[PDB]
Design a protein around this ligand. Sequence first.
Ligand SMILES: NC(=O)c1ccc[n+]([C@@H]2O[C@H](COP(=O)([O-])OP(=O)(O)OC[C@H]3O[C@@H](n4cnc5c(N)ncnc54)[C@H](OP(=O)(O)O)[C@@H]3O)[C@@H](O)[C@H]2O)c1
Ligand SMILES: Nc1nc(=O)c2nc(CNc3ccc(C(=O)N[C@@H](CCC(=O)O)C(=O)O)cc3)cnc2[nH]1
Ligand SMILES: [Mn+2]
Ligand SMILES: [Mn+2]
Ligand SMILES: [Mn+2]
Length: 159
Amino acid sequence: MISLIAALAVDRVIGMENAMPWNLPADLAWFKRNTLNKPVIMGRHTWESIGRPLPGRKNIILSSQPGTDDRVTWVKSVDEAIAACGDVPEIMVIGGGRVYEQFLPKAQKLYLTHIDAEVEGDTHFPDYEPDDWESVFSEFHDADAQNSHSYCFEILERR
Ligand SMILES: NC(=O)c1ccc[n+]([C@@H]2O[C@H](COP(=O)([O-])OP(=O)(O)OC[C@H]3O[C@@H](n4cnc5c(N)ncnc54)[C@H](OP(=O)(O)O)[C@@H]3O)[C@@H](O)[C@H]2O)c1
Ligand SMILES: Nc1nc(=O)c2nc(CNc3ccc(C(=O)N[C@@H](CCC(=O)O)C(=O)O)cc3)cnc2[nH]1
Ligand SMILES: [Mn+2]
Ligand SMILES: [Mn+2]
Ligand SMILES: [Mn+2]
């Protein structure tokens, strides 16, 4: 099974200038809980944005060019990325925009954080079709001293 995990600001913005400008520790904790001990697939730009391997996960990087770091696994196509995960219950696709576009048609589950924040951005999560997806979990949180915007964790499953 393939799942996508992402945090979206207003208008489905996910990034600006190869960065995420906000800081929401509760959402990063949610990301870690839902990805630990699973393979994670990311594109090369997202690899550069994170800047280091994510511990406790098999890190698989998509790039058309040879890899430059043997601490992670480098693959050249979607099918190779999936194969490199092996026989696991759940593969996590962690972006960015171009990668989300390619994996969305193959995904059964979306883990989305909706952040109440207006961000200028240059990268968006794909337009998906709402009728295709059922909300199976949602949890709203007001802003607090650690998290400066309100946010909503949602899990969608393909109908
Ligand atoms: N808010 C969130 O949840 C979230 C999550 C992830 C990322 N982001 C943000 O998203 C942005 C990065 O997204 P992006 O769309 O620019 O880039 P991306 O999807 O991370 O990376 C695209 C790169 O991946 C490689 N690639 C993708 N598909 C491939 C394929 N089928 N075969 C081979 N290589 C493939 C290519 O690398 P080569 O050019 O080397 O061939 C391509 O240039 C940043 O702003 C980041 O902060 C946000
Ligand atoms: N919900 C969500 N939030 C995100 O921030 C996110 N980020 C990416 C890609 N970028 C990043 C950037 C940093 C870290 C990171 O530092 N993660 C640590 C945090 C642990 C914690 O804060 O508790 C990790 O071990 O996962 C992960 C992904 C993909 N999907 C996401 N999905
Ligand atoms: Mn092929
Ligand atoms: Mn197999
Ligand atoms: Mn806000």
